[PDB]
Amino acid sequence: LPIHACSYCGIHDPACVVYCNTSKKWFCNGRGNTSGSHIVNHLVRAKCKEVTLHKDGPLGETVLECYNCGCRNVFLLGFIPAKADSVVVLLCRQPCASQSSLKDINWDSSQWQPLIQDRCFLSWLVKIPSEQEQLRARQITAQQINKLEELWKEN
Ligand SMILES: [Zn+2]
Ligand SMILES: [Zn+2]
Ligand SMILES: [Zn+2]
Numbered sequence: 070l071p072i073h074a075c076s077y078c079g080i081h082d083p084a085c086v087v088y089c090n091t092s093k094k095w096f097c098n099g100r101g102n103t104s105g106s107h108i109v110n111h112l113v114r115a116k117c118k119e120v121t122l123h124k125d126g127p128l129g130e131t132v133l134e135c136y137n138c139g140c141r142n143v144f145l146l147g148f149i150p151a152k153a154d155s156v157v158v159l160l161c162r163q164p165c166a167s168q169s170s171l172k173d174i175n176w177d178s179s180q181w182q183p184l185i186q187d188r189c190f191l192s193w194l195v196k197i198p199s200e201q202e203q204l205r206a207r208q209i210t211a212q213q214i215n216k217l218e219e220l221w222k223e224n
Contacts, residue, residue: 073123075099077107077214078206083125084196090119090132090141092221098190099198103211106189106197110211114218118142127193133184137165147183148191149176159184 073088074081075097086095087108092115096108103110111117119141124130134141136158147166148157158176160166168178184190189197198206209217 075107075206077101077111077209077217078203080198080202080206082196082198082202083123084127085198085202086123087190087195088121088123089115089117090121091115091117097198097206098192098195099203099206100189101203101206102208103214104188108190108195109185109188110214111218112143114215115222118144122195126195133159133194135159135161135165137161137170140165143184147181149178149180149182152177 070079071081073083073086073095075086076094077096078101080097080099085097085099087098088095089111096111098106098108100106120133120143122128122131132141133143133146135146137160140161145161146159147162148159149166150157162181164170166178166181171178184194
């Protein structure tokens with residue numbers, strides 16, 4: 070089982086996993102038996118904010134951070150598409166993605182959208198594991214997560 074396997078379930082598709090900078094562990098973008106996806110569960114429970122994407126994923130090894138100020142809080146970051154072009158930019162909801170800051174010089178502020186929606190990352194950032202790949206993994210519940218998380222913070 071590879072180093073980048075989800076610390077909850079063991080899914081190891083490079084496109085599906087997300088690295089957590091603070092706790093140095095990988096978590097997938099699938100929801101399993103839980104109501105949120107695994108990284109989001111972790112980021113909420115462990116009280117974490119910063120992540121990195123896999124070398125082999127859609128965006129290569131990228132630390133997700135605000136283009137303007139370098140703030141890395143994933144709960145605040147969102148993306149703005151470029152018009153007639155696919156060279157997206159990542160910015161803080163505030164103040165970096167405001168019409169005060171952007172002034173419509175290079176980016177259209179009204180076009181901002183959170184990186185995390187529906188308690189998980191957008192599929193083009195981190196792909197969602199398939200139906201059968203989620204079945205092959207460890208069928209963990211929300212209560213085992215909470216205990217595993219606590220068993221970790223012991224160390
Ligand atoms: Zn997982
Ligand atoms: Zn963490
Ligand atoms: Zn910013």
